[PDB]
Amino acid sequence: PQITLWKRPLVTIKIGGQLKEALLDTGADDTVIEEMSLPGRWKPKMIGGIGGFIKVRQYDQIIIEIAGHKAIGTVLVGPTPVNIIGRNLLTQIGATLNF
Amino acid sequence: PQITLWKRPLVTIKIGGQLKEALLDTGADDTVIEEMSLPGRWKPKMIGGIGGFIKVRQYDQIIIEIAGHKAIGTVLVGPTPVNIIGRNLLTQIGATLNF
Numbered sequence: 001p002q003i004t005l006w007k008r009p010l011v012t013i014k015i016g017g018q019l020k021e022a023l024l025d026t027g028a029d030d031t032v033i034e035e036m037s038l039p040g041r042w043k044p045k046m047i048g049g050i051g052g053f054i055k056v057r058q059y060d061q062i063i064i065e066i067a068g069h070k071a072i073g074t075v076l077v078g079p080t081p082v083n084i085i086g087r088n089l090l091t092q093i094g095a096t097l098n099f
Numbered sequence: 100p101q102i103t104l105w106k107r108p109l110v111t112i113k114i115g116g117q118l119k120e121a122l123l124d125t126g127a128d129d130t131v132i133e134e135m136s137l138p139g140r141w142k143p144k145m146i147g148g149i150g151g152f153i154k155v156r157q158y159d160q161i162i163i164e165i166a167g168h169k170a171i172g173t174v175l176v177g178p179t180p181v182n183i184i185g186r187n188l189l190t191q192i193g194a195t196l197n198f
């Protein structure tokens with residue numbers, strides 16, 4: 001698809017058997033999802049942005065479906081205000097910025 | 100151009116005659132720049148990012164060039180960790196997300 005940016009670029013994702021709404025975020029290096037459980041091992045990480053840092057759990061090799069397109073990669077889980085699909089997964093679905 | 104997302108989508112901007120680096124950020128509603136002086140009056144605004152909310156200075160109708168494209172619109176000034184071009188100016192330069 002071609003998504004214009006008059007409004008927030010929200011899409012439906014499937015992660016851990018759950019449907020969620022998430023923001024396609026070119027300014028995010030990583031993918032950060034609100035608290036949920038995911039299977040497998042994880043390790044703690046700190047990520048920072050406007051407002052400062054939050055502690056998250058880093059899960060590797062997690063499959064997501066993003067607007068119908070499957071990807072795999074690292075997902076960070078923690079107290080993010082918004083679910084964010086960052087570049088680590090946007091690349092996998094072939095997303096580009098065009099102007 | 101067509102910008103892929105394997106690296107951060109950093110571009111050169113020009114504001115107040117000065118070149119700066121900024122991130123093209125589809126997850127940002129608003130454009131937020133590090134401390135600098137801009138002309139005119141400002142208005143207060145709070146913005147909420149991943150670590151919580153910060154105070155910024157809102158300057159309206161600021162001339163800004165983004166990757167060679169001319170925009171005139173609102174710029175927020177405050178303690179952001181990187182200069183971010185948000186949707187208010189991405190729309191002015193004609194940017195879309197495509198996959």
Ligand SMILES: COC(=O)N[C@@H]1CO[C@@H]2C[C@H](OC(=O)N[C@@H](Cc3ccccc3)[C@H](O)CN(CC(C)C)S(=O)(=O)c3ccc(OC)cc3)C[C@H]12
Nearest residue numbers: 027028029030048049050081082126127128146147148149
């Ligand atoms: C509901 O809250 C809002 O809608 N806030 C507003 C949305 O737009 C206004 C400007 C600010 O936007 C953001 O902070 N946007 C966030 C992504 C974002 C968006 C929204 C909330 C938190 C984080 C960014 O797109 C991604 N961020 C990085 C940039 C600040 C460099 S981030 O979320 O902090 C971030 C940081 C690290 C990371 O992986 C390492 C992944 C993401 C905040 C306000």
Ligand SMILES: [Cl-]
Nearest residue numbers: 006007008009
């Ligand atoms: Cl919106």
Ligand SMILES: [Cl-]
Nearest residue numbers: 072073074088
């Ligand atoms: Cl990854």
Ligand SMILES: [Cl-]
Nearest residue numbers: 091094103104
């Ligand atoms: Cl590619």
Ligand SMILES: [Cl-]
Nearest residue numbers: 172173187188
């Ligand atoms: Cl504007």
Ligand code: NA
Nearest residue numbers: 040041060061
């Ligand atoms: Na894993």
Ligand code: NA
Nearest residue numbers: 139158159160
């Ligand atoms: Na002004």
